Design a protein around this ligand. Structure first.
Ligand SMILES: [Mg+2]
Ligand SMILES: [Mg+2]
Ligand SMILES: [Mg+2]
Ligand SMILES: [Mg+2]
Ligand SMILES: [Mg+2]
Ligand SMILES: [Mg+2]
Ligand SMILES: [Mg+2]
Lengths: 40, 100, 94, 59, 166, 149, 140, 75, 102, 286
RNA sequence: UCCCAAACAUAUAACUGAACUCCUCACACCCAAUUGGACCAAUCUAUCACCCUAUAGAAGAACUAAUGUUAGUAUAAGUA
RNA sequence: AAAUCCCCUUGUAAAUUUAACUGUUAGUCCAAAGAGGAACAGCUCUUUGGACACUAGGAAAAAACCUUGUAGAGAGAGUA
């Protein structure tokens, strides 16, 4: 749902394709240390 | 004047956008029932020489009429009021897991 | 009532079938997609003469790696330590 | 809502009586909006294994 | 073979302190290798199951089935050693706890049929088991009343949760 | 299958980690044979790693008993009373270390089907839904098709 | 050297234990039990696909029920939230409806407000400016 | 047509692949034009350099932007 | 996965996060934060300076055995496999917000 | 007869497991079981709790008066030297006195409007027999407890738990013990209602006096919502109005039970123990 | 043999929909006949091991099915 | 007539030869071109392609019609 609108706006049809919602790291250490990169 | 939804039953919903437009603010305070929309609580419902004791009004009923009375008072069917055999009575879990 | 002679989808008297609205909508949107494909395939960047032999060097080197990989098959080296490591199966504390 | 456990569950799984006036109405449209109420399909907490159906009265 | 029922009368419990109540007397008795069908004897065992010893004797005395007199003697001798050897004060203060029949050892004989055929018949033998407990028979379970149905239905309605969610 | 295996809800032990984290592993007992190929992996494990593992986890008591046996075993006990027994019959050293480390992180609860991948004692903050949540109230709350006075 | 199987009792017990809760002779006879245990194992493996499908359908039903209480349709609510760059899946939307009625009502208001904005934009010829909630945040 | 799809490396569906716009490639593409979607390549930032080779991202609209920051546009 | 979390609750991740048990981390991807009277939404994500949520690892265990069986009638096709998926349990400790709306 | 040994050996273990399950042995103390070392176990006890306990205080914390008497009886029968062990009676009183004060102080800051009687009951509930026993069992306190019989009685188990708290208080101090009790005793009232921890009779009766104290008029009850009144499954939403202003709403199957629930809801809001209240702060202070 | 889902012309085109694809993680782990491999229960022997195992050699070396053979017990049936 | 054979570039990674043998060639259905004394169908038989005897979804139930394959867990999502 909403894929066609996403394609018009210039984003991926699948919201999980590319963008901050998936590309950005999900977690980081409490003190502020960045987490290691994920395999995906 | 405009309202996306009529705010009269659950909560008044206000929608706003941040200065940068990257966040949506929704302030939804709850509503209360007005005093004028309630009914009062229904409080209202001789030469006696003998004490009026609690009399046994529990009359025995056959399986037929007793099930019929249960079905009409609970608006259900007659099937669920019949007993089950030992096979099903033993497969039931007397110690189910508990959550929340 | 309502028997169909023979099978439903094969035979002389089959079950009649009709198209739907979304069945058409799917066909046109597929037809439009190829219309895009037909247009974008009509503007080659170069001609056959210009392209002739512009990738021959990379193709040849790729095949030489394929030849080298195929001709390098041989039994692996056999060492003495791995054959001697089986002596450890009887190792025990003093 | 600071409700006790038993009253909170009781209110959530309660039964609501609905009334419908069928005068000059198509039976199917009447039956359409009555099926959801009877099955409890209008409840956000609906589930098939849960007896969440409601009462429907049609005049 | 197995003869555990006979040994059940040889188990001895430790002496009881005055704080705990009286342990009711129990007697295990059984008769082996009875020329009877275990299925047929099952009906008599179920009939006298849960009743008093003397009521069971009265019911068995006037029963026309052959197995009735066999159980009647078994109940009689079970009552005898109960008072005599099992410290039972009143011989009529006994009720049947469990009565059942088990398959005994059976022989295989040939039953002749026509056209030279045959069928293997079986001489059925069975055992009868009985346990007597001192004291009046427990009252039978009363029928479940309508109010009992009412509260149970309420409990089911109150025990339902929102499923497949938090 | 799930219908043939008991299940339980997701939970912890005494709200572990809410204020502080308490290691759920409490005791480890190792059975090792001096002679025998089945205990070679167990033997070399305690030569080089059981010392370092003990220092890493100070709240866990480790017992190493050396007796003749055909199958080396490790027994793990938790504060909730659960007991886990794992055989060390003919395994290597890098894989017993992973096996031993796994028992340390476990909370001791039964490893069975979990009904819900989430658990909370307060599923709602604004109140659970009820049939009157989205129902307006009329004047004096008159019922449908009724009159007053 | 004559060899005979000595652990057949354990070989059949590993199958009979999975059928202990069945009904009939197929819970104790190995010949019958092996045929139904295989079917039970196969059904369990393929039931995982059905669980994912059925759970989504349950969420859609609950979302539709809550939306209809707010005078909204499920297609209208789902599409408008996507146009608002609010990427909430069906589970959390159902979770919000059941447990956070006021938050869900705000989301329904947002969808309806967005729906009216799109209608006005389509009503115009494009000369009019964009809607307040129709603006999209660009990411580079 | 199966072999042609094999040659162009189009095994997994919905997986974009770049190809040279030359008559030889065009000839192969014309056979399976009913199974694929063809779009041109746009390079608004030009051909990527070695420094930014890890920062490229092929957006859904058909261009390969060499600067991927995962940050909202300040405009 | 999208989780509706609050304070003092447990959620199960069907994976290993390569973290020591007891360590506390931060979850930077927050799509919605709501309260009794107000609710804030991200487009599609909230700013890092607006909301902060932290969780603590409390369990790293394996899953119960799962049966993967495949059978085809009259073809002698029967295969069985048993797998256990590593999982991690996290307890959400606190959810904090800051007055950075302006 | 089939030649072989492994199959018979495996079968013997299976039968013994069935024999064990048929009549499980009575529970025995973990100390009497093999693989035990009191010095080693009590050393890891402090490290497991991330605390620096005192060996002498901790060792005598688990000693009970009943255990001392049993040992004196055992040596008297053997006719045999004198023990110098000290019971944990004084340590338990120190732990109990501090825990009651610390719990009372902690709840007063969190709920300033909580009445004193409500404060006492919650502390009584937290220091109740079952709460400490449940915590002690899950903290392996009973395993190290030196008693005369197994399992340890709840009264003895509770005394032992308060003893180690006093031992920690002497070894570490009030500031460290305050964090300890918060981490293991405060956490026992997470998902429980105020009246689920403080049993009360007549919620409306003291609701009137509470509004009397706040200089507010008496609440009146009115029927906000009703459903199925004449049936066997009714629902009544009774709300309380003061000066024609709603303060609380309460559901119930009958009018009477709905009114009591409305009173309970009002008391929770008045005392600040609502489900919407902010969660307890377990973060280390700055 | 007994029609056959129940229904509904009027609230702005999206939405629903696979084991296809994407996301976290892990990947030898869904074809007949046939072929190529990786392992392995149980038993004997050589040497170990000593609450039942290890490395090798050997073989009467593994049964949901042949109206399969022998033995036991059910079904019809407490029926003829 | 549709089309084939041959075939540099290019896209690609396969192909030929040597050694060693087992197993299949009693097939079905659909689209198309045909043949069976100058038979519109039907019956039988050739040729090209696809599917089936290998997964899943959809046409009501569905071996052969449409969508789709490379294999696991997930209480995610976009689509055919
Ligand atoms: Mg037909
Ligand atoms: Mg004759
Ligand atoms: Mg796939
Ligand atoms: Mg794979
Ligand atoms: Mg053989
Ligand atoms: Mg046979
Ligand atoms: Mg008959």
């Amino acid at each position: 749902a909403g894929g066609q609108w996403r394609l018009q706006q210039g984003l991926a049809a699948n919201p999980s394709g590319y963008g901050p919602l998936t590309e950005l790291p999900d977690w980081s250490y409490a003190d502020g240390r960045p987490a290691p990169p994920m395999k995906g | 004047t405009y309202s996306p939804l009529p705010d009269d039953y659950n909560c008044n919903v206000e929608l706003a956008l941040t200065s940068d437009g990257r966040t949506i603010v929704c302030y939804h305070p709850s509503v209360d029932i007005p005093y004028e929309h309630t009914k009062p609580i229904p409080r209202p419902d001789h030469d006696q020489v003998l004490k009026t004791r609690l009399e046994e009004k529990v009359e025995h009923l056959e399986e037929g009429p007793m099930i019929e009375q249960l079905s009409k008072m609970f608006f259900t069917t007659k099937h669920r009021w019949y007993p089950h055999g030992r096979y099903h009575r033993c497969r039931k879990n007397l110690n189910p897991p508990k959550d929340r | 009532r309502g028997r169909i002679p023979g099978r439903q989808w094969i035979g002389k008297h089959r079950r009649p079938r009709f198209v739907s609205l979304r069945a058409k909508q799917n066909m046109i949107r597929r037809l439009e997609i190829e219309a895009e494909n037909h247009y974008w395939l009509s503007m080659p960047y170069m001609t056959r003469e210009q392209e002739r032999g512009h990738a021959a060097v990379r193709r040849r080197e790729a095949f030489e790696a394929i030849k080298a990989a195929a001709t390098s098959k041989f039994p692996p080296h056999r060492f003495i330590a791995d054959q001697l490591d089986h002596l450890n199966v009887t190792k025990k504390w003093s | 809502s600071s409700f006790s456990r038993a009253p909170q569950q009781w209110a959530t799984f309660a039964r609501i009586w609905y009334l419908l006036d069928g005068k000059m109405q198509p039976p199917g449209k009447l039956a359409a909006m009555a099926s959801i109420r009877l099955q409890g399909l209008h409840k956000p907490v609906y589930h098939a294994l849960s007896d969440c159906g409601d009462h429907v009265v049609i005049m | 073979i197995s003869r555990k029922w006979e040994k059940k009368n040889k188990i001895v419990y430790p002496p009881q302190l005055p704080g705990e109540p009286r342990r009711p007397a129990e007697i295990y008795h059984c008769r082996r290798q009875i020329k009877y069908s275990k299925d047929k004897m099952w009906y008599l065992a179920k009939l006298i199951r849960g009743m008093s010893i003397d009521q069971a004797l009265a019911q068995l005395e006037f029963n026309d089935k052959k197995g009735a007199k066999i159980i009647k003697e078994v109940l009689l001798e079970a009552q005898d050693m109960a008072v005599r050897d099992h410290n039972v004060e009143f011989r009529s203060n006994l009720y049947i706890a469990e009565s059942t029949s088990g398959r005994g050892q059976c022989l295989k004989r040939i039953r002749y049929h026509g056209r030279g055929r045959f069928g293997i018949m079986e001489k059925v033998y069975c055992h009868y088991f009985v346990k007597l407990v001192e004291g009046p028979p427990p009252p039978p379970e009363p029928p479940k009343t309508a109010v009992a149905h009412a509260k149970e239905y309420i409990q089911q309605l109150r025990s339902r949760t929102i499923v497949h969610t938090l | 299958t799930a219908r043939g295996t008991p299940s339980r809800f997701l939970a912890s032990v005494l709200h572990n980690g809410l204020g502080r984290y308490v290691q759920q592993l409490q005791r480890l007992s190792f059975s090792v044979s001096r002679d025998g190929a089945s205990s070679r992996g167990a033997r070399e494990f305690v030569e080089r790693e059981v010392i370092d593992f003990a220092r890493r986890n100070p709240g866990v008591v480790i017992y190493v008993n050396s007796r003749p046996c055909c199958v080396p075993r490790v027994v793990a006990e938790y504060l909730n009373g659960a007991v886990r027994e794992e055989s060390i019959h003919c395994k290597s050293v890098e894989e017993i270390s992973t096996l031993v480390q796994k028992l340390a992180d476990q909370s001791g609860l039964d490893v069975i089907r979990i009904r819900k991948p989430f658990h909370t004692d307060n599923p709602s903050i604004q109140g659970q839904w009820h049939p009157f949540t989205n129902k307006p109230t009329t004047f004096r709350g008159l019922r449908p098709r009724e009159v007053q006075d | 050297l004559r060899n005979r199987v000595t652990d057949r009792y354990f070989r059949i017990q590993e199958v009979l234990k999975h059928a202990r809760h069945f009904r009939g002779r197929k819970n104790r006879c190995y010949r019958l039990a092996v045929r139904t245990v295989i079917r039970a194992f196969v059904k369990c493996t393929k039931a995982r696909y059905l669980k994912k499908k059925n759970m989504r359908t349950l969420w859609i039903n609950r979302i539709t029920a809550a939306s209809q209480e707010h005078g909204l349709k499920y297609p209208a609510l789902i599409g408008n939230l996507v146009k608002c760059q609010v990427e909430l899946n069906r589970k959390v939307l159902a979770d919000l409806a059941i447990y956070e009625p006021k938050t869900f009502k705000s989301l329904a208001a947002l969808a309806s407000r967005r729906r009216h904005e799109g209608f006005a934009a389509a009503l115009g010829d494009g000369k009019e400016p964009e809607g307040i909630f129709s603006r999209v945040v660009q990411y580079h | 047509e199966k072999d042609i799809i094999k040659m162009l490396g189009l095994e997994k569906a919905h997986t974009p692949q770049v190809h040279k716009n030359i008559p030889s490639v065009n000839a192969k593409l014309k056979v399976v034009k009913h199974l694929i979607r063809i779009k041109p390549l746009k390079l608004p930032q030009g051909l990527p350099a070695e420094e930014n080779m890890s920062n490229t991202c092929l957006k859904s609209t058909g261009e390969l932007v060499v600067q991927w920051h995962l940050k909202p546009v300040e405009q | 996965r999208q989780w509706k979390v609050t304070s003092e609750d447990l959620i199960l991740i069907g994976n290993e996060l390569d973290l020591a048990c007891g360590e506390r981390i931060r979850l930077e991807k927050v799509l919605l934060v709501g309260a009794d009277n107000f609710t804030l939404l991200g487009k599609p994500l909230l700013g890092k300076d607006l909301v902060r949520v932290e969780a603590t690892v409390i369990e790293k265990t394996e899953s119960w055995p799962r049966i993967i069986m495949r059978f085809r009638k009259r073809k002698n096709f029967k295969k069985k496999r048993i797998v256990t998926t590593p999982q991690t349990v996290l307890r959400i400790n606190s959810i904090e917000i800051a007055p950075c709306l302006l | 007869v089939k030649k072989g040994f492994r199959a018979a050996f495996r079968f013997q273990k299976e039968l013994e497991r069935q024999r064990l399950l048929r009549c499980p042995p009575p529970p025995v103390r973990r100390s009497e079981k093999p693989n035990w070392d009191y010095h080693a176990e009590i050393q890891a006890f402090g490290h497991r709790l991330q605390e620096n306990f005192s060996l002498d205080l901790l060792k005598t914390a688990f000693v009970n008066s009943c255990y001392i008497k049993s040992e004196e009886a055992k040596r008297q029968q053997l006719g045999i030297v004198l023990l110098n062990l000290k019971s944990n009676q004084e340590l338990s009183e120190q732990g109990t006195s501090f825990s009651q004060t610390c719990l009372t102080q902690f709840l007063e800051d969190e709920y300033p409007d909580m009445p004193t009687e409500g404060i006492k009951n919650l502390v009584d509930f937290l220091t109740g027999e079952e709460v400490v026993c449940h915590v002690a069992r899950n903290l392996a306190v009973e395993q190290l407890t030196l008693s005369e019989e197994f399992p340890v009685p709840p009264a003895v188990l509770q005394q032992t738990f308060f003893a180690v708290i006093g031992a920690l208080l002497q070894s570490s101090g009030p500031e460290r013990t305050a964090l300890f009790i918060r981490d293991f005793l405060i956490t026992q009232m997470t998902g429980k209602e105020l009246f689920e921890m403080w049993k009360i009779i007549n919620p409306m009766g003291l609701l009137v006096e509470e509004l009397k104290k706040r200089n507010v008029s008496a609440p009146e009850s009115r029927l906000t919502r009703q459903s199925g009144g004449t049936t066997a499954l009714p629902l009544y939403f009774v709300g309380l109005y003061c000066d024609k202003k709603l303060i609380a709403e309460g559901p119930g199957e009958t009018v009477l039970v709905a009114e009591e629930e409305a009173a309970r809801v009002a008391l929770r809001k008045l005392y600040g123990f609502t489900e919407n209240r902010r969660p307890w702060n377990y973060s280390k202070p700055k």
